[PDB]
Design a protein around this ligand. Structure first.
Ligand SMILES: *Cc1c(COP(=O)(O)O)cnc(C)c1O
Length: 470
């Protein structure tokens, strides 16, 4: 009667460790995996303990559909304090005049943030232009083939990509300018997932105005760098700026949408001023358009991450991120590796493995087997996305653990050793071999000892550094 009811109360207060050992262990094994490994996936990072704590708060429970001062349900005085605080901070982090900029901090992640913007400004079947996927663009920027529209962006809107010059490695703004006059985009996306150089925002803005299109920046990858001023800000030339809250910003998974406010334009003779309406449209799209109840626990993590993003420690961190990237880039360049574009203005680089006689697909697996985390990626000039020539390496994750230039040089050496091992296996299985066979030889008995040797040396080196979280 009441024996089991007390057991119920004990169930909701019982620690994860006892309540679900199966899930507890998976988390433990994962924490260990992250500790002993070398994280070089550009999109990765480590959230601060303060941010992670906010996620487990009672904020999870409150349904707060709507916005501060425009809620559906009542009892949101504390939730309103939090959301208003989070957006106040978001504007500060980028030094934005509240009278000129506004922000929506409700997007569940980066992709939902982007889609929300298209839904509000582009509308069904409206045209969008983004960097081609194999050229370093993101799925949310549009992706389709002769056969089908793959990304939701291509499915609900009409997208056509602009490309990177296969020779230089830089975005071909000239071809974009030409095609925009033919396509008539309603919105141009200025953002990348795998690009080492700064974007010519002013030029993009010019091309946008010529076609009466919106210029939307997707700063997901460089959000942290832009915050610390380590890279030029997209806010000066863009109408809308979307972003992820994790990655280089070090918060929890979520997203934000920044939009222009105030005077859009004026009439020379009448003096009548037209104002921006981005705030209303974008807010309406997030809710009641696309999303439901806000994830207040995440909005807290974001708010916390934004306070940290404004500290000097963070600024130093971001400068170190770029310094480590330069160190890593030049170390590999000196070693005969071809870096697309020759270098980088940010946290990542794209290494063209054709310079060493191999590809990123094979190199990715070998490096993984040795606890070196990174991802394959097509290079400008690749005749097939099935056999990508490069590897995308980013420094934010390891930099957060304390790594410095000297450490990144050691990391560069470790990476090269992985490539040697890759080359060995590649030649050992023949020149007409498939990726399927390569994976088998890698997990085979012949290279078992070599992999373990390198893996252990990698793991013992990574183990020397702290792992933010706990
Ligand atoms: C990371 C990223 C996103 C957001 O991805 P989510 O996994 O949905 O958070 C969107 N656009 C770009 C360019 C990104 O790099």
């Amino acid at each position: 009667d009441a024996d089991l009811w007390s057991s119920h109360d004990k169930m909701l207060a019982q620690p994860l460790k006892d309540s679900d050992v199966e899930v507890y262990n998976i988390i433990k094994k994962e924490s260990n995996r992250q500790r002993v490994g070398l994280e070089l996936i550009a999109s990765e990072n480590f959230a601060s303990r303060a941010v992670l704590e906010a996620l487990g708060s009672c904020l999870n429970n409150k349904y707060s559909e709507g916005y501060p001062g425009q809620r559906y349900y009542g009892g949101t005085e504390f939730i309103d304090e939090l959301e208003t605080l989070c957006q106040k901070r978001a504007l500060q982090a980028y030094k934005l005049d509240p009278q000129c900029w506004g922000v929506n901090v409700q997007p569940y992640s980066g992709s939902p943030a982007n889609f929300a913007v298209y839904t509000a400004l582009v509308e069904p079947h409206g045209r969008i232009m983004g960097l081609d996927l194999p050229d370093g663009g993101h799925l949310t920027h549009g992706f389709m083939t002769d056969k089908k529209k793959i990304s939701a962006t291509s499915i609900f809107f009409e997208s056509m990509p602009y490309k990177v010059n296969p020779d230089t490695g830089y975005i071909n703004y000239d071809q974009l300018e030409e095609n925009a006059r033919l396509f008539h985009p309603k919105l141009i996306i200025a953002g990348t997932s795998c690009y080492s150089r700064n974007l010519e925002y002013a030029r993009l803005r010019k091309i946008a105005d010529e076609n009466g299109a919106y210029l939307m920046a997707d700063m997901a990858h460089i959000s942290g760098l832009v915050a610390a001023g380590v890279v030029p800000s997209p806010f000066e030339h863009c109408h809308v700026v979307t972003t992820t809250t994790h990655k280089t910003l070090r918060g929890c998974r979520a997203g934000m949408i920044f939009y222009r406010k105030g005077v859009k334009s004026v009439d020379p003779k009448t003096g009548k001023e037209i104002l921006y309406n981005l705030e209303s449209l974008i807010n309406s799209a997030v809710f009641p358009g696309l999303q439901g109840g806000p994830h207040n626990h995440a909005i807290a993590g974001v708010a916390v991450a934004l306070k940290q993003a404004m500290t000097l420690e963070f600024k130093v961190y971001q400068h170190q991120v770029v310094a480590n990237c330069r160190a890593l880039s030049e170390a590999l360049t000196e070693l005969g590796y071809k870096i697309v574009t020759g270098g980088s203005d940010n946290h990542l680089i794209l290494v063209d493995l054709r310079s060493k006689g191999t590809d990123g697909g094979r190199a990715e697996k070998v490096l993984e087997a040795c606890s070196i985390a990174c991802n394959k990626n097509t290079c400008p000039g690749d005749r097939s996305a099935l056999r990508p020539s490069g590897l995308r390496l980013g420094t934010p994750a390891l930099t957060s653990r304390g790594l410095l230039e000297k450490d990144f040089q050691k990391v560069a050496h470790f990476i090269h050793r992985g490539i040697e091992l890759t080359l060995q296996i590649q030649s050992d299985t023949g020149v007409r071999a498939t990726l399927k066979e390569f994976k088998e030889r890698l997990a085979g008995d012949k290279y078992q000892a070599a992999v373990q040797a390198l893996r252990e040396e990698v793991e013992s080196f990574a183990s020397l550094f702290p792992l933010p979280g706990l």
